[PDB]
Amino acid sequence: SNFINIHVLISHSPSCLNRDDMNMQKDAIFGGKRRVRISSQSLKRAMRKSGYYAQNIGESSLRTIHLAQLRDVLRQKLGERFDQKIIDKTLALLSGKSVDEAEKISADAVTPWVVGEIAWFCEQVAKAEADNLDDKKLLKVLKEDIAAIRVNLQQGVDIALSGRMATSGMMTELGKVDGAMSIAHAITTHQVDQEFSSGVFYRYANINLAQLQENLGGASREQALEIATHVVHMLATEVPGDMVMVNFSDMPLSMANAFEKAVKAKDGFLQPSIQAFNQYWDRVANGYGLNGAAAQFSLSVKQMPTLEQLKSWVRNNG
Amino acid sequence: SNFINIHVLISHSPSCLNRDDMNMQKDAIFGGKRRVRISSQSLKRAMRKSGYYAQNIGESSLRTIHLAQLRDVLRQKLGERFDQKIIDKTLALLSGKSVDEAEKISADAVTPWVVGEIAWFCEQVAKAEADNLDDKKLLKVLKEDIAAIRVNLQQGVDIALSGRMATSGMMTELGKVDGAMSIAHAITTHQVDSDIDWFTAVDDLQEQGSAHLGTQEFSSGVFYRYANINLAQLQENLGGASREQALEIATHVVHMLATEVPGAKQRTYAAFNPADMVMVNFSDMPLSMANAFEKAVKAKDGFLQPSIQAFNQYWDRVANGYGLNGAAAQFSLTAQVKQMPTLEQLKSWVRNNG
Amino acid sequence: MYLSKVIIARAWSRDLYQLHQGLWHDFLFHVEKCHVLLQSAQMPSTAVATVIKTQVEFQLQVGVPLYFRLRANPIKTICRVPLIKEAEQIAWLQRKLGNAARVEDVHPISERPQYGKIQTVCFEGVLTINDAPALIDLVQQGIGPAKSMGCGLLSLAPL
């Protein structure tokens, strides 16, 4: 199977998580009732900026629209390895914006950058320069091996996970990346307006294994399964400012509809949420005849003793 | 019993599955209230492009308006089979446009092409070339056996299901296809007040706020999906295929209608939900159930449960009031409706002609 | 004590300062929309302040969970400068609540400034009753400065 579905049932405070322009906690209507919400882009930045990410996956991506302070940074980082000329030409051709000594140069939009990837382009611009390669022809030569460019996204894995959009310059054909990870917005499983209870949020995400391999320049399934495990951890632990389920499938599957009918419980939401998740899962796998490799870690379908075991089970496929 | 009707209730988590030019969710007023909406052309292309389609039905049709690019694709795919001249002439005759070395050759409109169909024409053009048969007589004789042309649509079933329109070339006479499947716009069972996501784009290089701000509309909803298949028409559009073969196509469609979901904004909203109820019946006339939810369904422990109760309650009224019999089967996560515990069980019930 | 629903004719409800006068013709009020909730020691109707509906003294109990909402003016002093940090705001709230109740969960909404300036913050969440009579006095007296500017009124609701 090519899809690995991650089902996290984390539990914490429904307050002070994600704000809007009115500094209020984000929400959403589901099943006709209000749920506290944390946006998918909130989760993703929380992950790639966390220490766990830096320790297990690597360096995050430089996301900027200011190309003028950027052209400083690559000069002051690729100073030795490349000529000051080439280091500017590369950025210009890449973004389409003619580079200058301007201190104000803006791209079309905020795009993630990878220093390693840019350093690679310089090498090709270098061979261009020496062998004379009129940029139009150079573009053709580079179009032949996108895979030899996607490899440099091992430096910027968050890109390969969440994709990149480009509408200007040479990045239009060479830089377009379709994200390998699809992630839902985290929502509570219950109505947020009996005893006081913490919030129980359902989180969902999946990873297109083949796409992730492709986005990394043809990495092995083992390498992709590794990144997948790190994602499972971050999605199950990290909180902006319990129960984990993982299954393999040919087509993505969310369990959000388990909580379509909001969970009601006079003294604690986690336990009926887990039951609701289990009840729905049984009905879906039965009705749609799904037999993919599944594994569930829960202290209350191969059960797992800890998160780390599940985290290792995933790394061994099923 | 020429018509097989497909009824689907499918609940989605917060998402934006189909939007317009303002990046806002498509909607529709029904029963006097706003319903979130997925266009029928969005569903069809989602199915057309799906992995399930490519492995259970086959390769989808090539839909283009750029005949210069299509010329190169044909010169490559059929280059080892026909002479370049045969390929060009055949494209010129079918499209009504002149196919030369021009960098840009445009058709009248976007047209669904089948490489297998084109190849079949290339053979007739080749033979007519040898018999010194001019293009007028060639068109005159090809018009005599349309069924022999429609056989090639087995390599482009999306055309046989959704039809084709032509206004130039021989396709005006030879390629006019009336779709076998009629599909509705997906409409939510209930009134929806859409939510808004205040998003932001943190520049890692800006000391100020984010480099970009903005909003995005989204919501959840219990959608009703409707479609039906004209079996006689499907058999016809495939060159005279069997009733059994047509039923096979139908069951694939039944599957996808309960399974396939548009990929729009799913990378960031991930509403990969399967259907929660599938209903199929055979009839002499197509019958939609959308009026079950004309009065918008109010939430009572969710929208899904009362939606299905609305669907079943109305289904019973229509069947009684109009004396509506005919094989009927339902699969959910009226005594005439055989309950199916499994989708696969339901699908085989359809292959077995109800 | 009297709980009321009061409407103050738009003519009166032009500036914040004008608000307390109309109701006066102390007590506690919070703007809902001018729509206003009125907690008063006496039963509240002028042509400038119409009364939609009005009496309560709660039984309460110890160790009972309750929803709560409160506008307030959390400030420091070196002039009364606002407390903007989320940590400072939540710490401020539990402090001024003293030993009346503990803050189980709360969301501080940094409201838009009102007009000297008054930076109001609406605290919404859930409490559990620690000191029952000390909670009442806190309600009947209000919480924080700028109490006449709509701030200070603690609203309570069961679950």
Among A37, A30, A31, residue whose Cα is nearest residue A14: A37
What sign results for the dihedral spanned by CA atoms B307, B308, B309, B310?
positive
The residue to which tokens 């084709």 are assigned: B164
Whole-number Å distance between alpha carbons of B54 and B57? 6
Q: What's the CA angle centered on B218, arms A34 and A38, to 5 degrees?
A: 55
Q: What are phi and psi of B293, to 5 degrees?
A: -120, 25
Among C133, C147, C69, residue whose Cα is nearest residue C99: C133
Distance from the Cα of A308 to chain B's closest Cα (Å) equals: 26
The residue to which tokens 């219990």 are assigned: B222
Contact C126 A24 (CB under 8 A): no
Q: What are phi and psi of C129, to 5 degrees?
A: -70, 115
In sequence order, the 6+-apart residues with CB closer than 8 A to the CB of B334 are: B312, B315, B316, B319, B328
Residues of chain C contacting A23 with CB distance shorter than 8 Å: 109-111
Whole-number Å distance between alpha carbons of B259 and B123? 39
Whole-number Å distance between alpha carbons of C5 and C90? 29
Residues of chain B contacting A205 with CB distance shorter than 8 Å: 270
Whole-number Å distance between alpha carbons of C159 and C64? 10
Contact C86 A193 (CB under 8 A): no
The residue to which tokens 């009905």 are assigned: A283
Distance from the Cα of A112 to chain B's closest Cα (Å) equals: 9
Contact A193 C159 (CB under 8 A): yes
Whole-number Å distance between alpha carbons of A158 and A38? 19
Per the entry, the structure determination technique was X-ray
Instruction: For B298-320, give the DSSP string.
Output: PPSSSSHHHHHHHHHHHHHHHHH
CB-facing half-sphere around the CA of A196: CA atoms within 13 A: 20
Q: Which helix (H) or strand (E) element contains residue A275?
A: helix A270-287
Whole-number Å distance between alpha carbons of A90 and A118? 8
Whole-number Å distance between alpha carbons of B81 and B90? 13
Burial B35-69, CB ≥16 within 10 A → b, else e: bbbbbbebbbbbbbebeebeeebeebbbeeeebee
Output the CA–CA distances (angstroms, integers) from residue B210 to A114, A165, B236, C39, in the order listed.
Answer: 20, 18, 59, 42
| Angle, helix A115-131 to helix A86-95, in steps of 10 degrees | 110
Per the structure block, which two tokens stand in for A15?
A: 């307050």
3-state SS assignment for residue B9: strand
Whole-number Å distance between alpha carbons of A270 and A258? 13
Whole-number Å distance between alpha carbons of A284 and A306? 25
In sequence order, the 6+-apart residues with CB closer than 8 A to the CB of A55 are: none
In sequence order, the 6+-apart residues with CB closer than 8 A to the CB of B83 are: none
Which residue from A25, A194, A196 is facing C107, i.e. has the nearest CB?
A: A25
Domains and CATH numbers, chain C: 1-58 (no CATH), 59-159 (3.30.70.1210)
- End-to-end Cα separation, chain C, in angstroms: 23
- Length reported for chain A: 318
Neighbouring C-beta atoms of residue B121, cutoff 10 Å: 25
- End-to-end Cα separation, chain A, in angstroms: 10
CB-facing half-sphere around the CA of A46: CA atoms within 13 A: 19
In sequence order, the 6+-apart residues with CB closer than 8 A to the CB of C19 are: C8, C12, C13, C29, C31, C34, C36, C149, C150
Whole-number Å distance between alpha carbons of B169 and A177? 40
Neighbouring C-beta atoms of residue A73, cutoff 10 Å: 15
How many domains does the structure of chain A reveal?
1
The residue to which tokens 């959009």 are assigned: A165
3-state SS assignment for residue B344: helix
Whole-number Å distance between alpha carbons of A293 and A274? 20
What DSSP character marks residue B154? G
Beta strands C121-129 and C101-109 are antiparallel
Whole-number Å distance between alpha carbons of B286 and B231? 12
Q: What are phi and psi of B249, to 5 degrees?
A: -60, -45
What DSSP character marks residue A316? G
Q: Do the Cβ atoms of A243 and A298 come closer than 8 Å?
A: yes
Contact A16 C65 (CB under 8 A): no
For this entry, resolution in Å reads 2.5
C87 at the A interface (CB within 8 A)? no
Contact A15 C107 (CB under 8 A): yes
| Long-range interactions of C103-107: CB distance < 8 A, separation 24+ | C103/C127, C104/A196, C104/C65, C104/C128, C105/A13, C105/A14, C105/A15, C105/A196, C105/A198, C106/A15, C107/A15, C107/A16, C107/A24, C107/A25
Burial A32-71, CB ≥16 within 10 A → b, else e: bbbbbbbbbbbbbbbbbeeeebeeebeebbbbbbbbbebb
| Beta bridge partners of residue B198, listed in sequence order | B215
Label residue B66 left, alpha or beta by phi (over 0 means left) and psi (-120 to 50 means alpha).
Answer: beta
Beta strands A186-188 and A199-208 are antiparallel
Q: Which domain holds residue B264?
A: 1-354
Per the structure block, which two tokens stand in for B223?
A: 């959608």
Neighbours of chain C (3+ CB pairs under 8 A): A
Q: What are phi and psi of B161, to 5 degrees?
A: -90, -35
Beta strands in chain B (DSSP E): 3-15, 27-30, 33-38, 62-66, 106-113, 181-183, 186-188, 195-201, 212-230, 277-283, 328-332, 337-339
| Angle, helix B135-142 to helix B84-95, in steps of 10 degrees | 70
Q: Give the gyration radius of chain C's Cα atoms.
A: 16
Q: Give the gyration radius of chain A's Cα atoms.
A: 23
Output the CA–CA distances (angstroms, integers) from residue A237 to A13, A83, A231, C107, in the order listed.
Answer: 13, 44, 10, 22
Interface contacts (A, C; CB < 8 Å): 30
Among A74, A65, A45, residue whose Cα is nearest residue A158: A45
Neighbouring C-beta atoms of residue B166, cutoff 10 Å: 21
Q: Which helix (H) or strand (E) element contains residue C32?
A: none
Closest residue in chain B to residue A113, using alpha carbons only: B204
Q: Do the Cβ atoms of B2 and B246 come closer than 8 Å?
A: no
Within A96-194, residue ranges assigned H as helices are 115-131, 135-143, 147-150, 157-162, 171-174
Contact B202 A45 (CB under 8 A): yes
3-state SS assignment for residue B163: coil
Whole-number Å distance between alpha carbons of A170 and A11? 45
Q: Do the Cβ atoms of B287 and B81 come closer than 8 Å?
A: no
| Beta bridge partners of residue C31, listed in sequence order | C36
| Angle, helix B115-130 to helix B67-77, in steps of 10 degrees | 80
Between chain B and chain C, are at least 3 CB pairs below 8 A? no
Distance from the Cα of A19 to chain C's closest Cα (Å) equals: 9
